[PDB]
Design an enzyme around this catalytic site. Structure first.
Site, PDB file in Angstrom:
ATOM      1  N   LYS A   1       1.242  -3.281   8.960  1.00 28.31           N
ATOM      2  CA  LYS A   1       2.444  -2.475   8.797  1.00 28.31           C
ATOM      3  C   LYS A   1       3.676  -3.327   9.069  1.00 28.31           C
ATOM      4  CE  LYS A   1       2.754   1.664  10.267  1.00 28.31           C
ATOM      5  NZ  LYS A   1       2.631   2.849  11.160  1.00 28.31           N
TER       6      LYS A   1
ATOM      7  N   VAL B   1       3.250  -0.599   4.189  1.00 27.59           N
ATOM      8  CA  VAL B   1       2.057  -1.231   4.742  1.00 27.59           C
ATOM      9  C   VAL B   1       1.383  -2.150   3.725  1.00 27.59           C
ATOM     10  CG1 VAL B   1       1.504   0.419   6.565  1.00 27.59           C
ATOM     11  CG2 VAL B   1       0.838   0.906   4.205  1.00 27.59           C
TER      12      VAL B   1
ATOM     13  N   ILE C   1       0.819  -1.205   0.000  1.00 23.64           N
ATOM     14  CA  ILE C   1       0.000   0.000   0.000  1.00 23.64           C
ATOM     15  C   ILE C   1       0.859   1.265   0.000  1.00 23.64           C
ATOM     16  CG2 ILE C   1      -1.874   1.243   1.128  1.00 23.64           C
ATOM     17  CD1 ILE C   1      -2.645  -1.491   0.045  1.00 23.64           C
ATOM     18  N   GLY C   2       1.899   1.277   0.829  1.00 22.54           N
ATOM     19  CA  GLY C   2       2.785   2.423   0.918  1.00 22.54           C
ATOM     20  C   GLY C   2       3.830   2.289   2.010  1.00 22.54           C
TER      21      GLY C   2
ATOM     22  N   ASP D   1       0.683  14.716  14.759  1.00 20.83           N
ATOM     23  CA  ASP D   1       0.775  14.590  13.309  1.00 20.83           C
ATOM     24  C   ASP D   1      -0.598  14.554  12.632  1.00 20.83           C
ATOM     25  OD1 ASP D   1       2.409  14.545  11.064  1.00 20.83           O
ATOM     26  OD2 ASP D   1       2.291  12.357  10.894  1.00 20.83           O
TER      27      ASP D   1
END
Ligand SMILES: CCN(C)S(=O)(=O)Nc1cccc(-c2nc(C(C)(C)C)sc2-c2ccnc(N)n2)c1F
Lengths: 238, 244
Positions: free
Chosen positions: A30, A18, A16-17, A120
């Site tokens: 993750k 995970v 996904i990016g 964040d």
């Protein structure tokens, strides 16, 4: 009282990016791709797990377990708030925008009540499954930084970041559209000479929301409201 | 970690149903189950049932949020928008495409598999303990002299097990495909208690509708097995539905 998932029970899938996974249904995994975790990599894992396991709220990403470095959460179908606002063809009505603001305020209020600082908060960390706040935190991101953040981080810092998210919702655009250099935003906002353009807000935006927004975006960290009052105001006008 | 919510933090609202369930305000909308009670003997009896809900972190299981001791004993969970699978199937008459029915069945299999993985026995799975949050997401709750339609024969006559849960799920599968309760033809609790208990009565599979996957109907029968041991487990129950 063990959220350790014995490894081998999880079927990891596409990146996904995970990764997207399969445990007892769809999950989001993750995976920390390292040979052997450094002493810094270890405490980072414990800390995220330690703070995740203290959250049980509908507007917070559902932490399901860990593996030893992996963090398993619920799978969320759909895109983040960032995609929908900035990189999407379809916009939202006001009733929905205020609704997204309320749920996020509920989640943020929940976290603060638990002595947790996200540190964040941004539209990219808000998943529109139902608002889901993820990507944790303790107990590019420059646009969502309070003047004192450019220890700076506090509940007030989250309040400011929340203010920018409101700005994204009520305008559709990111703050400081007239700037393409990061170093000056850092300087101008950091000094206290730059602030989001609240004249850009939609005509549909209730004066109430536009007022609340300015409060969360206060230059001085101590003039910013708290989420109990932030949720109260949003809940009221809704 | 203590998940106890201090006195006064919850604003109790309208009564929903009978402990007793209310809608409350706690960092948003919540649900409060006021227990019909405290005694120090019962005090620790309450925590046992909570320290079991404490190990449920799944999307298809009702989100346990916390508990209360003052003023009275209470269970705090997420609030679910919409009604139960029972109300949708036997009250609202809401027409679900076969597409959704399987997904509801799929999600319930996920939730039940997860519970059994945590070695938790529901002991009372029925279509009104399954809430369709947002009319999309399945929420299984109420597992922490009434409804007998979901009761296995070995339960009627270690009677509660993982297989007895499987049976209740089979009845749920029956409700989804047939769109109605089993033994509707017979309106007599004592008869059903007697006939199902001895093993001479079982759900009528002639009432399931044409648009039913023959793997699912075959799966129904596996769960509706009168014999406890002849029933498939939830990993396999889920694997087959998922593939299907
Ligand atoms: C995790 C599950 N446990 C904590 S539990 O076994 O106590 N489960 C649990 C906890 C708190 C409330 C309820 C609940 N109970 C209801 C009945 C049918 C038993 C009267 S409705 C209902 C409900 C929960 C949320 N939203 C709406 N609209 N209704 C519940 F099932």
């Amino acid at each position: 009282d063990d959220w350790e998932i014995p490894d081998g029970q999880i079927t990891v899938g596409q990146r996904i990016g995970v990764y997207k996974g399969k445990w007892h249904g769809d999950v989001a995994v993750k995976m920390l791709n390292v040979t052997a975790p450094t002493p810094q990599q270890l405490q980072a894992f414990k800390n995220e797990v330690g703070v995740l396991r203290k959250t049980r709220h509908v507007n917070i990403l559902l932490f399901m377990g860990y593996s030893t470095l992996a963090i398993v959460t619920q799978w969320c179908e759909g895109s983040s708030l960032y995609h929908h606002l900035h990189a999407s063809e379809t916009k939202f009505e006001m009733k929905k925008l205020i609704d997204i603001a309320r749920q996020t305020a509920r989640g943020m209020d929940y976290l603060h009540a638990k002595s947790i600082i996200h540190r964040d908060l941004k539209s990219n960390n808000i998943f529109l499954h139902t608002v889901k706040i993820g990507d944790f935190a303790t107990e590019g991101s420059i646009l969502w930084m309070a003047p004192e953040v450019i220890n700076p981080y506090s509940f007030q810092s989250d309040v400011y970041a929340f203010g920018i998210v409101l700005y994204e919702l009520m305008t559709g655009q990111l703050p400081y559209s007239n700037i393409n250099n990061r170093d000056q935003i850092i300087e101008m906002v950091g000094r206290g000479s730059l602030s989001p353009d609240l004249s850009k807000v939609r005509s549909n935006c209730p004066k109430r929301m536009k007022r609340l927004m300015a409060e969360c975006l206060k230059k001085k960290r101590d003039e910013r409201p708290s989420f109990p009052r932030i949720l109260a105001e949003i809940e009221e006008l809704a």
